[PDB]
C-alpha cells in the first residue's frame, strides 16, 4: 500500500461551525453532518507530495523538529519516533524565543553536559539540597532541551501537530525563512504554513496515522525499515 485510502477512516472530520474561507477548497457544502470533514482525493495528493518532499529533503541529512505537546498519546509516540532515529524534539511548549537564536541553547546544553558528567559522582557526597537541586535542573533540561541535545544548527524542517494550538511556534516559524510543515484543520490557517496537511488531530487515530506517515518518511531516508505506508497491512493500533 501507499497511504491507501481504504485504511483512511477517521482523517475526515473536525470541530463544528468555526471554519473560514481559507478552507473553502477543502470542504464541500454542508448540511448532512455539520462536523467539518475533508475531501479524500485532495488530502491524498497533498500527503503524497509532503511525503516525497520530506524524503527528498531527508536524503541530505535534514533536521526535523516535532511538536510533542498534545496530551499524552501522540506525545509518547512521537517521543519514540524522535528517539529511535535521533533528532530534535520537545515535550513542553516554547516559552517564546525558544527558536530565535543559539546562545540560550548553547549555554543550556553545556550546562546539561556538565550536569550529566558531574552528578554521576554526587548522590550523597555533596549536600542533600545539592542532590535535589541538581535533579531538579536535570528534570528541567529534560523538559526543554533533553528532547534536543544534538543541534549543529536549528532544524531545517519541523512538523506542527496543531497551529491553532501552537500560534507562537508557527509565528517564529514564519519569522524565519525556514520551510514549514504542519497539520491543518478547519480552525487552522493554511495560509501561513508552507505545507498543507488537512488531517484531524482531536481524535488520536488520525494523529497516529500521520505519525506513522512521517516516521516512515524519515525512516527510509536513513536506511531504516518501514512499518506502514509501504505495508499493505491496515494500521491496527487502537486508542488507549
Amino acid at each position: 500500500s501507499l497511504a491507501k485510502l481504504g485504511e483512511m477512516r477517521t482523517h475526515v472530520g473536525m470541530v463544528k461551525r468555526y471554519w473560514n474561507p481559507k478552507m473553502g477548497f477543502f470542504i464541500e457544502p454542508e448540511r448532512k453532518h455539520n462536523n467539518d470533514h475533508f475531501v479524500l482525493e485532495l488530502q491524498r495528493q497533498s500527503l503524497q507530495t509532503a511525503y516525497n518532499y520530506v524524503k527528498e529533503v531527508a536524503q541530505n541529512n535534514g533536521q526535523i523538529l516535532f511538536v510533542g505537546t498534545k496530551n499524552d498519546y501522540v506525545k509518547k509516540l512521537v517521543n519514540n519516533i524522535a528517539k529511535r532515529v535521533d533528532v530534535a524534539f520537545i515535550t513542553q511548549r516554547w516559552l517564546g524565543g525558544t527558536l530565535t537564536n543559539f546562545k540560550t541553547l548553547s549555554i543550556s546544553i553545556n550546562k546539561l553536559n556538565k550536569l550529566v558528567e558531574k552528578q554521576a559522582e554526587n548522590a550523597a557526597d555533596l549536600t542533600k539540597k545539592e542532590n535535589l537541586m541538581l535533579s531538579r535542573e536535570i528534570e528541567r533540561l529534560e523538559k526543554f532541551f533533553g528532547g534536543v541535545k544534538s543541534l549543529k544548527r536549528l532544524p531545517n524542517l519541523l512538523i506542527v501537530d496543531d497551529p491553532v494550538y501552537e500560534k507562537n511556534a508557527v509565528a517564529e516559524a514564519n519569522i524565519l525563512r525556514i520551510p514549514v510543515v504542519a497539520l491543518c484543520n478547519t480552525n487552522t490557517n493554511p495560509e501561513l504554513v508552507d505545507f498543507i496537511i488537512p488531517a484531524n488531530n482531536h481524535q488520536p487515530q488520525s494523529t497516529c496515522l500521520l505519525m506513522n506517515l512521517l516516521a516512515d518518511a524519515v525512516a527510509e531516508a536513513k536506511a531504516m525499515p518501514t512499518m506502514f505506508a509501504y505495508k499493505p497491512d491496515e494500521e491496527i493500533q487502537i486508542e488507549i
Binding site: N52, Y53, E56, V57, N60, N156
Partner: peptide, 5 residues
C-alpha cells in the same frame, strides 16, 4: 516547490 537541499 520542494526539493530543498
Amino acid at each position: 516547490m520542494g526539493n530543498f537541499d
